[PDB]
Write a protein that binds this ligand. Structure first.
Ligand SMILES: CCOP(=O)(COc1ccc(C[C@H](NC(=O)O[C@H]2CO[C@H]3OCC[C@H]32)[C@H](O)CN(C[C@@H](C)CC)S(=O)(=O)c2ccc3ncsc3c2)cc1)OCC
Lengths: 99, 99
């Protein structure tokens, strides 16, 4: 589909058998999701933006479904105020910016 | 143009007569630029990001040219990690997400 930017570009995603709302975010290098108890091994990481850094758990090779499109890659989990889908997954669903 | 997301969507902008690099960011509601001198009145404002809140200078009705496309709108100036073009100006240049 084509998503205009009058409102936050929020979409439903499916991760770990759960449905969540996430922002399609071209400014996010990586995908960051609100705290959730994913199984598997993980590595600590810190990611920074406006206001400083937060501590997150980095999980690799996680499958996510974004509006029916399937994607698999690194997901960071942590105390983020919003779920963000980042470039690492947006590239996989064929997402582009057009103006 | 159609911009893919394998690399950061960095573009040249023209603001206050000076060229700069900025990231097109569909997860940003607002446009936030690193510290710089901007002609005009401004009011103090706060904006919240992943890491908390920061103090910025809010400049209203600023002319900015983004890959040749003209926008006129609010620009926030403060300690952001990178210059970001937010939805308030992306909508002006007719930007959409497509996948
Ligand atoms: C209801 C809202 O609650 P809130 O007010 C704010 O919540 C939020 C709303 C949206 C976003 C997404 C973020 N946008 C943003 O910061 O936009 C601000 C400017 O425009 C305003 O609108 C939105 C907020 C205001 C950017 O898109 C992405 N970022 C990087 C960017 C800043 C360039 C370095 S990233 O998220 O830091 C991030 C993600 C993955 C990653 N991998 C490695 S680094 C790394 C960094 C974050 C928080 O809570 C305050 C405590």
């Amino acid at each position: 589909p084509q998503i205009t930017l009058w409102k936050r570009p929020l979409v439903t995603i499916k991760i770990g058998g759960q449905l969540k709302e996430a922002l399609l975010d071209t400014g996010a290098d990586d995908t960051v999701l609100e705290e959730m108890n994913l199984p598997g091994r993980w590595k600590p990481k810190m990611i920074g933006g406006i206001g400083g850094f937060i501590k997150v758990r980095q999980y690799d090779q996680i499958l996510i479904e974004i509006c029916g499109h399937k994607a698999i890659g690194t997901v960071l989990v942590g105390p983020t105020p919003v779920n963000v889908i980042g470039r690492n997954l947006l590239t996989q669903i064929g997402c582009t910016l057009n103006f």
